[PDB]
Amino acid sequence: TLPKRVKIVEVGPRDGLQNEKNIVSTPVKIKLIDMLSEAGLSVIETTSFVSPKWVPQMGDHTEVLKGIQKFPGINYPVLTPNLKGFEAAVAAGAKEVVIFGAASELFTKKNINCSIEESFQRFDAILKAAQSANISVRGYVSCALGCPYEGKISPAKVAEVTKKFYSMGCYEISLGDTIGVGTPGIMKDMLSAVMQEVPLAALAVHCHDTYGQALANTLMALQMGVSVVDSSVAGLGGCPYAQGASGNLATEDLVYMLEGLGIHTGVNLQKLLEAGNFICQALNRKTSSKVAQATC
Amino acid sequence: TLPKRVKIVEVGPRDGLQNEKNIVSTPVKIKLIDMLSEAGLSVIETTSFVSPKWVPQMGDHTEVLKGIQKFPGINYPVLTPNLKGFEAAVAAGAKEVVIFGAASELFTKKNINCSIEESFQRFDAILKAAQSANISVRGYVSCALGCPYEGKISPAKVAEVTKKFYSMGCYEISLGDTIGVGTPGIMKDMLSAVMQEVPLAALAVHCHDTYGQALANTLMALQMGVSVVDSSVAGLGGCPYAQGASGNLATEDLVYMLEGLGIHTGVNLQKLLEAGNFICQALNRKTSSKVAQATC
Ligand SMILES: CC(C)(COP(=O)(O)OP(=O)(O)OC[C@H]1O[C@@H](n2cnc3c(N)ncnc32)[C@H](O)[C@@H]1OP(=O)(O)O)[C@@H](O)C(=O)NCCC(=O)NCCSC(=O)C[C@@H](O)CC(=O)O
Ligand SMILES: O=C(O)CC(O)CC(=O)O
Ligand SMILES: [Mg+2]
Ligand SMILES: [Mg+2]
C-alpha cells in the first residue's frame, strides 16, 4: 500500500528548462531555483555541466550552481555527462551528480554510438571519481516504459541496467518514461522486474505526460511502493523524440494528488504555484499545470 | 482488479458542448455525433431536453436527436429533468433518458431548482412512465467527490442517493466529480460506501480534469471494479464553478490507457481523434486531449 511520505525531485530548472523553446537569463534561473527551495522541495535538479557546443540552454551551469542559495538540507544535484563535466561540477561546489543511461540499445547508439555496455565504462569513470571525492551519484534510466526506436522494452532489460547502475555506485535510480508512452500496466510490470534485484528505497519514477498518462503511471508506482518521483514545475519540459505534445509531469499537479491522499511531501503548494507562474512569465508560456490553471 | 472490457460513455455532444462558450449549429452537433458513432462508441450522450432558458446550447435537442443517424447497437441517451422533458424525448424517439441529481443539497438547488427529496418526486414520475414503455433510465449524482458550495461531501450521503436512484429504476448511475477536486483516496472511499448499497454493474464514474486528477481517479474506479466511465471528445467542457480551466476527461486519453492496459473498448482511436479535430475547429478551440496533441 501507499507510502506515508514521498520525496519529490524537482527537475524544472534542468530537465524542464533544457527542453524549453525560449531561454531565460541566469538571474531568472537562480530566482526560480530559489523559489523552488522556498517552496519546500528537498531536491532540485539545478543544471547540467555539459559542453555548451551541444546543449546551450545549460551553458550557465557554472554561474548558476554558485549563485543559488543552498538551503539547509535541500539537495541540488547536477548532471555530468562525462569526466570533464564531472570535474567542472566538483570544482563548482556540486555535492551530488546525475548520470543518464537507457534500457534501449538503439536509443543509446543513436545518442552516443555506444552499446548499452559500452556506456557503463564511461559512467564507471565518473562513479570511481565520485567515490574518492565523496560525492553522491544519481542514475537515470530512460526508455523504461518504451523506446521511440525499439518500441516496447522488456521489463527484464530495465531491471538489468538498473541493477548494473545500483551495484556500480548509484544510490538511487530514476526509471523514466522519457517519451510518455507507458500506461499503468507497463509501469507495474516494469517495476515488478526491477524490485527483484534492486531495493525499493533506491527507486524513483520519472514520467512524461506526453499522452496524459504521467499521473496515473505515477500513482501505480506509489502503489508498488516507490517513494520518490520526479516532476517539473509548470509542467515545463518536453521530449525531443515526441511530437508537439507535453513533457514532464506537473509538480503542482502531483503534490495536489499527494495532499488529497494525505501523503507528506513537505512542499508548500501556494509558494510552488508562485514559482511556476514566475518561470512561466519569464518564459512567455502558459503553464501546463491544471492545478495552476484552476487558480488563475 | 481491472475489468476485461469497459463501456465508455461519450458525453462530448452533451456535457462537453453545454459547458462551452462558443455555441454550435444544429448540423455540426449532428455531424459530431455521427462521427462519434463511426469512431466506435457504444453510447453517446446526444442532448438534453431542457428549458432553452437555463441552457440554450441544448435548445436544438429535438431536431438533433431526430437528425442523427441511429447506428445499430449504439445507444443515444438524453437528459430529462422534469416529466415535460421526458415526454418530449419519447416523442423525438429517445430510447433512453438521463435523470440527474446530486448528493449536494445546495447544488441541487441551483441546477434543477429544487431540493433532494423534491427531485425524488420528479424522477419517480419519469421512471414510472418509462418502465411501462421500455425506456431505460440512467442517473447522474453530481458532487460525488465534493461540492463547490458545500465543500466536503460524505461517502454515505452519496451512497444514500445512489441507492435511491437504483431502487427506483435506474439501470445505471453515474457518480460525478462535477468540479474534479477528487484524488484516488476519496474516489476509493466514495465507491466503497456505494458498493454496499448498489451492485457494481450499475455503477459508473464521471470525472472532470480541472485539477488534472480525472484519469487517476478513473483508474482507482477501475481497480475498484467499476467498468463504465464518462469522458468527452477533445476534453470539451469546463468547470463553470471553477477558474477557466480543463473540463471533462479526454475520451482519447482514456482509450489510450485502456488499450495499453489491454482492455477492450471497441473504439477506433484514429476516427475518434478525427471527430475530435472536427468539433474543435467548429468550436475554434485547441484540443485538451494530450494524445491528440502527441498524434499531430
Ligand atoms: C424546470 C426545472 C424544474 C426548473 O423550475 P422552474 O424554471 O422554476 O419552473 P417550472 O414550472 O418547473 O418550468 C420551467 C420552464 O421550463 C420549461 N420546460 C420544462 N421541461 C422542459 C424541457 N424538457 N425542454 C424545454 N423546456 C422545458 C417550461 O415549459 C417552463 O418555461 P417557459 O416556456 O419559459 O414558461 C429544471 O428542470 C430546469 O429548467 N433545469 C435546467 C437544466 C440544467 O441546469 N441542466 C444541466 C445538465 S446536468 C450536468 O451538467 C451534470 C452532469 O454532467 C453530472 C456531473 O458531472 O456533475
Ligand atoms: O530528458 C531527460 O530526462 C534526459 C536529458 O534529455 C538528457 C540530456 O540532455 O543530457
Ligand atoms: Mg525527462
Ligand atoms: Mg459533467
Side-chain angles (χ1 to χ4, degrees):
Chain A
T1 173
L2 276 38
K4 303 285 182 171
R5 40 248 304 168
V6 169
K7 192 224 294 175
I8 302 174
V9 177
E10 176 60 47
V11 297
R14 198 290 300 163
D15 197 25
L17 248 28
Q18 182 184 332
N19 301 82
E20 200 68 18
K21 301 62 202 165
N22 296 314
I23 58 170
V24 302
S25 61
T26 299
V28 164
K29 290 194 180 73
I30 304 180
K31 194 178 191 292
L32 168 59
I33 296 170
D34 285 357
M35 283 205 237
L36 289 167
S37 282
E38 271 189 354
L41 290 293
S42 62
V43 59
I44 306 170
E45 211 165 78
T46 297
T47 185
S48 171
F49 284 72
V50 59
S51 175
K53 317 296 176 183
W54 304 330
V55 30
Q57 314 72 55
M58 302 286 93
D60 54 5
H61 46 78
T62 291
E63 49 272 41
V64 177
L65 180 57
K66 294 170 187 174
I68 58 175
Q69 298 162 49
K70 318 289 181 295
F71 281 56
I74 297 191
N75 283 71
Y76 302 101
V78 300
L79 263 64
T80 42
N82 45 51
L83 191 54
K84 301 178 174 184
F86 172 96
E87 237 74 294
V90 171
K95 308 192 71 178
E96 186 197 326
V97 305
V98 182
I99 57 182
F100 67 117
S104 163
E105 298 286 357
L106 278 64
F107 187 99
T108 315
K109 286 162 185 172
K110 286 174 182 288
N111 276 59
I112 20 197
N113 285 167
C114 42
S115 65
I116 275 174
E117 190 76 3
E118 280 210 314
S119 54
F120 293 161
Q121 297 186 302
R122 305 165 57 173
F123 299 153
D124 183 271
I126 287 178
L127 267 160
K128 244 80 156 162
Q131 189 180 58
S132 65
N134 209 194
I135 294 180
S136 284
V137 187
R138 176 146 126 119
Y140 256 119
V141 181
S142 55
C143 296
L145 304 194
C147 167
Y149 305 119
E150 299 184 354
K152 281 181 166 291
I153 298 285
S154 171
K157 196 65 191 181
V158 178
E160 161 191 345
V161 301
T162 304
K163 182 78 193 74
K164 198 69 181 297
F165 257 132
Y166 186 62
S167 66
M168 186 176 284
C170 301
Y171 74 93
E172 169 178 295
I173 298 83
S174 193
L175 300 170
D177 180 2
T178 304
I179 57 178
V181 312
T183 49
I186 301 298
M187 179 48 78
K188 201 163 191 179
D189 295 315
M190 179 278 280
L191 285 192
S192 282
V194 173
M195 287 151 76
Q196 309 289 160
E197 286 302 70
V198 176
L200 189 37
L203 278 20
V205 144
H206 189 88
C207 310
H208 285 223
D209 205 49
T210 306
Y211 297 69
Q213 307 293 314
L215 198 56
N217 293 163
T218 287
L219 203 236
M220 180 74 251
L222 298 170
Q223 284 175 176
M224 290 287 86
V226 180
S227 56
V228 5
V229 354
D230 303 7
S231 69
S232 232
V233 214
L236 301 180
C239 199
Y241 316 86
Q243 294 193 57
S246 47
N248 297 289
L249 178 71
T251 312
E252 302 91 308
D253 291 8
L254 167 70
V255 307
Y256 186 80
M257 187 182 86
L258 301 175
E259 284 178 3
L261 259 31
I263 298 175
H264 175 65
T265 66
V267 173
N268 182 324
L269 189 35
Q270 2 301 176
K271 292 220 201 69
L272 209 213
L273 286 152
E274 277 173 45
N277 169 58
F278 166 66
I279 196 55
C280 271
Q281 306 191 350
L283 220 45
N284 191 233
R285 64 110 74 191
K286 296 305 171 186
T287 179
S288 301
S289 183
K290 305 303 201 79
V291 170
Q293 304 179 195
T295 287
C296 181
Chain B
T1 315
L2 312 184
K4 294 307 171 194
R5 33 220 308 160
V6 166
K7 183 219 291 179
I8 294 184
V9 169
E10 178 51 50
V11 303
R14 204 284 304 176
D15 194 22
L17 231 44
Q18 158 192 289
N19 283 147
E20 203 87 11
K21 285 70 179 183
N22 306 319
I23 60 175
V24 264
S25 77
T26 309
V28 172
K29 299 189 176 68
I30 285 186
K31 198 187 193 292
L32 173 69
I33 303 183
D34 285 354
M35 272 193 233
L36 288 181
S37 289
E38 293 183 357
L41 290 310
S42 77
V43 39
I44 301 164
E45 210 169 72
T46 297
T47 183
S48 169
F49 287 84
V50 158
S51 169
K53 293 295 186 190
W54 296 60
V55 37
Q57 300 73 55
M58 296 300 109
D60 51 359
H61 53 70
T62 285
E63 52 265 53
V64 169
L65 184 59
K66 292 191 172 195
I68 63 162
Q69 303 180 53
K70 304 305 185 297
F71 279 47
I74 299 185
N75 298 107
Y76 300 87
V78 300
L79 276 58
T80 61
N82 37 61
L83 196 61
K84 264 263 293 179
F86 162 86
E87 225 65 295
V90 189
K95 290 193 172 92
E96 181 175 304
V97 292
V98 193
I99 52 177
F100 49 96
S104 177
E105 260 296 356
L106 201 54
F107 177 100
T108 310
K109 289 182 173 60
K110 288 91 147 179
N111 196 235
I112 45 186
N113 183 79
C114 69
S115 282
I116 294 181
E117 189 75 340
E118 292 194 66
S119 80
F120 284 161
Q121 320 169 298
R122 284 151 59 165
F123 301 150
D124 195 294
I126 312 178
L127 293 122
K128 249 163 172 54
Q131 287 189 47
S132 294
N134 224 82
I135 292 185
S136 303
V137 174
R138 194 168 102 140
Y140 269 122
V141 184
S142 302
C143 310
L145 303 190
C147 167
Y149 300 119
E150 304 182 5
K152 274 190 169 303
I153 303 296
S154 153
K157 178 58 179 183
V158 177
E160 197 184 0
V161 290
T162 303
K163 177 63 172 176
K164 181 59 183 294
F165 281 5
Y166 176 76
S167 74
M168 295 192 275
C170 293
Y171 72 108
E172 169 179 302
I173 302 77
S174 173
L175 302 158
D177 185 356
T178 326
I179 50 175
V181 299
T183 54
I186 304 323
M187 173 69 78
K188 190 169 196 178
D189 295 316
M190 186 276 288
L191 281 190
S192 168
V194 178
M195 293 169 34
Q196 304 292 160
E197 310 285 51
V198 182
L200 203 43
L203 257 29
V205 178
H206 192 94
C207 303
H208 277 254
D209 205 50
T210 308
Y211 297 95
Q213 308 293 300
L215 198 61
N217 290 162
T218 296
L219 209 222
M220 185 64 252
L222 298 180
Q223 297 180 163
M224 287 288 81
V226 190
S227 65
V228 8
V229 336
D230 304 356
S231 66
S232 187
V233 204
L236 291 182
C239 201
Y241 332 75
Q243 301 297 50
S246 312
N248 284 292
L249 164 62
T251 294
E252 293 91 298
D253 304 344
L254 167 70
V255 315
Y256 182 78
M257 180 179 85
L258 299 180
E259 274 189 342
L261 246 34
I263 292 178
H264 172 73
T265 81
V267 180
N268 181 269
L269 186 51
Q270 325 301 167
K271 289 177 177 170
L272 203 191
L273 279 161
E274 284 180 55
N277 192 65
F278 172 65
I279 178 63
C280 274
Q281 309 211 301
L283 245 43
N284 190 196
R285 58 119 77 195
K286 291 275 190 180
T287 178
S288 281
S289 172
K290 291 273 192 163
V291 170
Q293 292 176 278
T295 305
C296 198

Short mmCIF file of all heavy atoms in Angstrom, two decimals, chain A residues 11 14-15 19 140 177-178 206 208 238-239 248, ligand 3:
data_model
loop_
_atom_site.label_atom_id
_atom_site.label_comp_id
_atom_site.label_asym_id
_atom_site.label_seq_id
_atom_site.Cartn_x
_atom_site.Cartn_y
_atom_site.Cartn_z
N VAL A 11 12.67 18.82 -11.20
CA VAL A 11 13.62 18.94 -12.30
C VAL A 11 13.34 20.15 -13.18
O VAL A 11 13.97 20.31 -14.23
CB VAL A 11 13.62 17.68 -13.17
CG1 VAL A 11 14.06 16.49 -12.36
CG2 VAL A 11 12.21 17.44 -13.72
N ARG A 14 16.37 22.00 -14.90
CA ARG A 14 17.31 21.29 -15.79
C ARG A 14 16.56 20.51 -16.88
O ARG A 14 16.68 20.83 -18.06
CB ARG A 14 18.20 20.34 -14.98
CG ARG A 14 19.47 19.88 -15.71
CD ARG A 14 19.14 18.93 -16.82
NE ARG A 14 18.46 17.73 -16.33
CZ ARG A 14 17.78 16.89 -17.11
NH1 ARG A 14 17.70 17.12 -18.42
NH2 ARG A 14 17.18 15.83 -16.58
N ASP A 15 15.80 19.49 -16.50
CA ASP A 15 15.01 18.71 -17.46
C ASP A 15 13.97 19.64 -18.12
O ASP A 15 13.75 19.58 -19.35
CB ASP A 15 14.29 17.54 -16.77
CG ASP A 15 13.81 16.46 -17.76
OD1 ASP A 15 14.41 16.35 -18.85
OD2 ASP A 15 12.85 15.71 -17.45
N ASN A 19 14.67 21.63 -22.14
CA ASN A 19 13.80 21.32 -23.25
C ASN A 19 12.69 22.32 -23.45
O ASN A 19 11.57 21.96 -23.79
CB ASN A 19 13.21 19.93 -23.06
CG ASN A 19 14.28 18.87 -22.96
OD1 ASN A 19 14.87 18.65 -21.89
ND2 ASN A 19 14.56 18.21 -24.08
N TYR A 140 19.94 7.75 -14.12
CA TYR A 140 18.74 7.94 -14.93
C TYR A 140 18.70 6.78 -15.91
O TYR A 140 19.70 6.47 -16.55
CB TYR A 140 18.83 9.23 -15.74
CG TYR A 140 18.01 10.40 -15.25
CD1 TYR A 140 18.63 11.59 -14.87
CD2 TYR A 140 16.62 10.36 -15.27
CE1 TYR A 140 17.89 12.73 -14.53
CE2 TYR A 140 15.86 11.50 -14.93
CZ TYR A 140 16.51 12.68 -14.57
OH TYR A 140 15.80 13.83 -14.29
N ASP A 177 9.98 7.44 -17.99
CA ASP A 177 9.17 7.18 -19.17
C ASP A 177 9.41 8.38 -20.06
O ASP A 177 8.55 9.23 -20.26
CB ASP A 177 7.70 7.05 -18.80
CG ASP A 177 6.83 6.79 -20.01
OD1 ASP A 177 7.37 6.65 -21.12
OD2 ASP A 177 5.59 6.71 -19.83
N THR A 178 10.63 8.43 -20.59
CA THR A 178 11.09 9.51 -21.46
C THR A 178 10.12 10.05 -22.50
O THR A 178 9.97 11.27 -22.61
CB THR A 178 12.38 9.08 -22.17
OG1 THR A 178 13.34 8.71 -21.18
CG2 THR A 178 12.93 10.23 -22.99
N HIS A 206 10.16 8.77 -13.19
CA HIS A 206 10.29 10.00 -13.98
C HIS A 206 9.37 9.84 -15.20
O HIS A 206 9.80 9.36 -16.25
CB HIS A 206 11.76 10.13 -14.42
CG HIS A 206 12.11 11.44 -15.06
ND1 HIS A 206 12.52 12.54 -14.34
CD2 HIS A 206 12.15 11.81 -16.37
CE1 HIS A 206 12.79 13.53 -15.17
NE2 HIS A 206 12.57 13.11 -16.41
N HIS A 208 6.81 11.31 -18.22
CA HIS A 208 6.47 12.47 -19.03
C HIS A 208 5.01 12.34 -19.42
O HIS A 208 4.52 11.24 -19.71
CB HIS A 208 7.41 12.57 -20.24
CG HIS A 208 8.78 13.06 -19.89
ND1 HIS A 208 9.46 13.99 -20.65
CD2 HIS A 208 9.55 12.83 -18.80
CE1 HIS A 208 10.58 14.32 -20.04
NE2 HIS A 208 10.66 13.63 -18.91
N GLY A 238 9.66 18.66 -22.02
CA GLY A 238 9.24 18.18 -23.31
C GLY A 238 10.28 17.21 -23.79
O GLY A 238 11.41 17.25 -23.33
N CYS A 239 9.90 16.33 -24.71
CA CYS A 239 10.86 15.36 -25.21
C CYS A 239 11.13 15.59 -26.69
O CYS A 239 10.20 15.83 -27.46
CB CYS A 239 10.36 13.93 -24.99
SG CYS A 239 11.69 12.69 -25.06
N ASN A 248 7.34 17.00 -18.99
CA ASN A 248 7.29 16.45 -17.63
C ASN A 248 5.98 16.61 -16.89
O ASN A 248 5.18 17.48 -17.20
CB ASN A 248 8.41 17.06 -16.77
CG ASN A 248 9.79 16.73 -17.29
OD1 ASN A 248 10.25 15.58 -17.20
ND2 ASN A 248 10.47 17.73 -17.84
MG MG C 3 12.95 13.58 -18.72
#
